[PDB]
Amino acid sequence: TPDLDAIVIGAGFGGIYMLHKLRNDLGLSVRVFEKGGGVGGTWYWNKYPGAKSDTEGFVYRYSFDKELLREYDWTTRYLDQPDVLAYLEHVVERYDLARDIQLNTEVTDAIFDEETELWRVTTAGGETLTARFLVTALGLLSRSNIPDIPGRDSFAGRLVHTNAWPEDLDITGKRVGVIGTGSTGTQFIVAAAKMAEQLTVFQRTPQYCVPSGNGPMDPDEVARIKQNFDSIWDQVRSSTVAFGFEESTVEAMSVSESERQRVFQQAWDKGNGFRFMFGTFCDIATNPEANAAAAAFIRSKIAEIVKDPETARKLTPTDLYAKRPLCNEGYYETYNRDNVSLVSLKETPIEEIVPQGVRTSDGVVHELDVLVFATGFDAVDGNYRAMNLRGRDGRHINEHWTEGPTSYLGVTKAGFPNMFMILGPNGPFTNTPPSIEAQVEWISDLIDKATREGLTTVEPTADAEREWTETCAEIANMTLFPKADSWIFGANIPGKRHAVMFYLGGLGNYRRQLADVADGGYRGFQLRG
Numbered sequence: 036t037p038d039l040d041a042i043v044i045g046a047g048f049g050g051i052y053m054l055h056k057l058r059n060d061l062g063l064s065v066r067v068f069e070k071g072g073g074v075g076g077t078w079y080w081n082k083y084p085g086a087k088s089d090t091e092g093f094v095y096r097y098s099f100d101k102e103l104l105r106e107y108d109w110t111t112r113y114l115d116q117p118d119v120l121a122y123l124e125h126v127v128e129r130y131d132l133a134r135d136i137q138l139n140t141e142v143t144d145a146i147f148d149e150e151t152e153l154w155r156v157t158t159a160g161g162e163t164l165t166a167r168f169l170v171t172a173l174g175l176l177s178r179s180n181i182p183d184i185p186g187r188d189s190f191a192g193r194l195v196h197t198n199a200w201p202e203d204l205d206i207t208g209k210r211v212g213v214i215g216t217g218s219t220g221t222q223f224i225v226a227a228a229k230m231a232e233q234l235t236v237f238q239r240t241p242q243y244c245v246p247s248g249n250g251p252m253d254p255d256e257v258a259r260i261k262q263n264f265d266s267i268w269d270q271v272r273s274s275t276v277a278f279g280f281e282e283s284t285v286e287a288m289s290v291s292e293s294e295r296q297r298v299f300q301q302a303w304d305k306g307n308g309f310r311f312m313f314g315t316f317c318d319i320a321t322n323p324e325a326n327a328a329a330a331a332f333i334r335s336k337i338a339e340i341v342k343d344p345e346t347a348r349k350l351t352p353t354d355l356y357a358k359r360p361l362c363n364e365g366y367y368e369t370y371n372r373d374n375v376s377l378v379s380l381k382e383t384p385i386e387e388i389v390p391q392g393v394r395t396s397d398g399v400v401h402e403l404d405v406l407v408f409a410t411g412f413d414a415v416d417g418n419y420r421a422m423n424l425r426g427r428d429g430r431h432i433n434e435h436w437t438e439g440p441t442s443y444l445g446v447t448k449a450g451f452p453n454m455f456m457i458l459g460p461n462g463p464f465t466n467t468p469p470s471i472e473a474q475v476e477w478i479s480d481l482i483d484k485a486t487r488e489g490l491t492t493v494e495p496t497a498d499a500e501r502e503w504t505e506t507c508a509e510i511a512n513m514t515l516f517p518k519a520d521s522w523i524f525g526a527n528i529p530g531k532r533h534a535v536m537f538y539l540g541g542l543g544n545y546r547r548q549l550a551d552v553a554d555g556g557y558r559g560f561q562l563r564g
């Protein structure tokens with residue numbers, strides 16, 4: 036007999052919904068452990084100025100409760116971090132979840148006992164307890180990456196990762212430096228430039244940024260959206276990327292030069308990064324000729340916006356437009372400000388961090404009060420590999436993942452009976468909440484099957500997981516995504532295996548894969564009584 040039916044790790048979008056399904060819908064005994072001082076995952080940690088959704092707010096939310104969709108108001112096209120946090124806090128209150136979420140509690144160990152067929156979980160605080168079912172909602176983008184830059188520990192000012200932004204820190208009138216120009220660094224740069232006396236950007240790799248088109252929402256437009264939510268969510272769940280817009284079915288090079296320009300400009304005017312990549316033409320990320328046309332359009336905008344030609348050059352990427360799409364309000368314009376400087380780490384790498392700032396290879400000491408690491412995450416597997424996470428034969432998860440992280444269907448792991456992952460490796464790459472709903476709902480159904488039928492273990496076969504890896508590889512290799520160095524294939528962390536870590540077939544196809552496996556008697560699972 037376990038202490039609980041189920042333990043859930045993480046209280047972001049993923050663990051919040053998982054706890055709701057298992058406790059409120061299935062009536063099981065459940066606890067969430069969250070290492071943070073508050074619920075909300077991403078939206079708890081990322082307190083930095085300019086932190087916001089790059090999915091439009093109308094579909095950056097749960098869908099599963101039709102009344103919550105009718106009730107809950109948003110006021111801006113994209114959701115600022117405090118607004119997302121307030122929404123998730125509202126969900127926790129609405130479903131009476133806080134009593135079963137244990138905060139400030141890091142899980143250090145999770146060990147499967149093959150004799151008892153129970154999971155034993157150990158906390159940093161030195162408590163252990165057992166559950167039949169373990170759900171890991173640890174976050175794809177949760178484990179902070181802070182590079183080992185020479186002299187980093189000598190800096191005498193405030194040095195923080197974006198994912199550790201402190202509530203107290205006011206950068207107004209300070210000299211601020213930021214390392215990184217992904218989605219986090221770039222939205223930070225736009226907000227920080229308005230506050231800091233001087234902002235120095237340390238850019239290793241420029242990315243292709245498009246407008247967000249952010250601004251206030253017409254309360255009548257919010258009302259109209261709520262009246263059409265059913266069709267909106269149907270289009271989301273059927274789509275590839277689930278961002279709430281109709282994906283193009285047109286091949287970029289099937290139309291005239293004049294029409295490509297018009298389509299690209301219309302998407303640029305409306306905003307959104309996923310709109311620019313998938314709302315224009317159907318083959319931006321698959322056809323190198325289409326990819327070149329999209330990239331060229333973005334480079335031409337950089338040249339128009341940025342007044343200093345050297346600054347324009349350092350901002351202009353020349354690589355494939357196949358990193359996750361970025362958007363911002365006023366990003367390139369920010370470099371026209373007198374108080375903003377751009378260091379290309381390609382031309383002048385960091386030599387040393389010193390007490391007073393950052394010295395680049397040109398010998399310049401960039402004097403800073405604050406140094407911000409917008410350096411991203413040990414993405415997908417980082418919080419798994421950091422855990423003493425052991426399956427059958429007492430093997431650590433690392434023993435299984437020597438060629439990169441693997442799963443069956445993104446949610447289960449061979450060797451790890453009764454363990455379910457929310458956004459485990461080799462799952463969908465979409466607007467996050469609807470992918471979380473597809474996984475939580477499916478995991479809920481399989482756990483309930485196990486309860487109703489008296490199963491002791493649910494586990495995928497080694498063969499099934501290997502076939503899933505090959506399915507993910509084939510789809511990935513039909514795209515340009517593997518030929519862009521980013522966190523998505525593990526290439527951002529020195530020493531990390533370069534490997535497929537997502538199913539890139541989209542939400543519609545992914546939901547079908549889950550449904551087909553469930554309807555076919557859980558094809559690839561051993562169900563033991």
Ligand SMILES: Cc1cc2nc3c(=O)[nH]c(=O)nc-3n(C[C@H](O)[C@H](O)[C@H](O)COP(=O)(O)OP(=O)(O)OC[C@H]3O[C@@H](n4cnc5c(N)ncnc54)[C@H](O)[C@@H]3O)c2cc1C
Pocket residue numbers: 044045046047048049050068069070071075076077078081086087088089090091095140141142143172173174175176177219418422457458465466467468
């Ligand atoms: C500023 C920002 C904006 C974003 N905007 C968007 C967007 O608009 N659209 C989009 O699609 N995605 C967006 N993302 C991606 C985002 O990760 C997801 O949208 C979503 O919030 C992920 O929720 P999750 O529950 O899967 O993970 P997380 O929110 O990362 O929650 C995981 C939690 O698990 C906890 N945890 C991990 N390991 C342990 C352990 N061992 N013990 C205890 N607790 C543990 C962590 O502390 C964390 O709170 C954004 C990310 C950032 C940083």
Ligand SMILES: NC(=O)c1ccc[n+]([C@@H]2O[C@H](COP(=O)([O-])OP(=O)(O)OC[C@H]3O[C@@H](n4cnc5c(N)ncnc54)[C@H](OP(=O)(O)O)[C@@H]3O)[C@@H](O)[C@H]2O)c1
Pocket residue numbers: 087088089090176182214215216217218219220221222237238239240359380409410411412520521522527
């Ligand atoms: N607006 C939003 O909704 C939003 C905001 C936050 C983040 N996100 C989500 O979170 C993901 C992660 O974004 P992120 O910006 O946190 O991380 P990221 O995309 O991994 O960007 C990390 C940045 O740091 C740089 N960097 C890494 N190591 C470095 C080093 N040793 N020296 C110098 N520079 C270094 C990288 O340069 P290289 O390219 O050279 O490695 C890159 O510019 C996004 O892709 C998205 O899914 C979106």
Ligand code: NA
Pocket residue numbers: 117120121124
């Ligand atoms: Na709040």
Ligand code: NA
Pocket residue numbers: 210211212233234235402403
């Ligand atoms: Na500065």
Ligand code: NA
Pocket residue numbers: 357358359516517519520521522523524
């Ligand atoms: Na990548």
